[PDB]
Write a protein that binds this ligand. Sequence first.
Ligand SMILES: [Zn+2]
Length: 413
Amino acid sequence: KLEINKFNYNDPIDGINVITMRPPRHSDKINKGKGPFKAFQVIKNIWIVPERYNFTNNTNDLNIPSEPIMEADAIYNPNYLNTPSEKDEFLQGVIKVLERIKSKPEGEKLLELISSSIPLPLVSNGALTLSDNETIAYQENNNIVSNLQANLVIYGPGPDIANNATYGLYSTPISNGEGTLSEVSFSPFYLKPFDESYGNYRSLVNIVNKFVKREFAPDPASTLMHELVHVTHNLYGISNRNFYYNFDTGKIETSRQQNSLIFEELLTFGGIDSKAISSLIIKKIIETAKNNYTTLISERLNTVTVENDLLKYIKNKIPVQGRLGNFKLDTAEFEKKLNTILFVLNESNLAQRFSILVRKHYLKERPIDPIYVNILDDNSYSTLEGFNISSQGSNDFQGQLLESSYFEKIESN
Ligand SMILES: [Zn+2]
């Protein structure tokens, strides 16, 4: 069954699970000369790179922004994650969060799905053949030693050290059914609190009604699972980032409006706000994906004349019927898989299965200053229960209360 590879940051290069990786975005001018970076294969096709994410236009500068800040709850420190000790701490934190995710069946299945769901390769000489959309390069002394399969690369945070995000490598495959390698910027130790109503906390005696809004920290396993849901959409080539859902009208629009949310985020977060999506929207989303997949099967998959391992992996990813050269989409099985990855797989549903508290709405009503927490201390955070450790009396979400001693205040200027 699925195993997570353990590592220390100082483990030696072996060309199997420990490499020096050339950035996937190395050809962009902003990334000239960067890397390579030490990288660790935690699960087949999933790599951890203990470096700050600085490889896109909006992440290239790790300093305090030179323009009006995006988020009032951001925290900046260009020096975070530049020492070997911080890199090992980060590596251990990501491994621990992954072990937590794997500890329940829904999380194990999500990780297995990311591991196995390679992007649809290009065809060369009749064979599915790998590209940089499905691999990372092991670079040593300005030579490429090998190209190793990768569906996901997990880095540390970008400029805001308490933010988390997912980036698909190629922008047509992210949305046309092919799929694309994804990069995630993740912060296991710097967390953004949220408000939720709750009644089991120390309260002044003169307050009659105890059930009120209280501050909580998120479980970073929920935060990572949220990004892993984006990754799954990216690997299936079904991402929905140009569409906005307008809460006032219940319709999809192609530009941001007054009371709207990016549809990709509405679905990925889930919860109450996805329960009243119209049947029209759902049918359109399914038809778009079906049409994209039907086109890829006829125009690409049916040009394959060579049965290799990549074809086996693709048949496991994409439900098809028929024989070589004459495949067809297995409509019923495709619809079932698509509806799972779009409408069942989401942060709110996963959190319920892990007894993790998440906020009610993707958009927060007010910013709360980020905190630091050392999740490597098993007395604060365990792989089996997160912060909500029963033997310490912290089950039923109590361990996520922000007043808990392990949530440490950060002073920012
Ligand atoms: Zn998101």
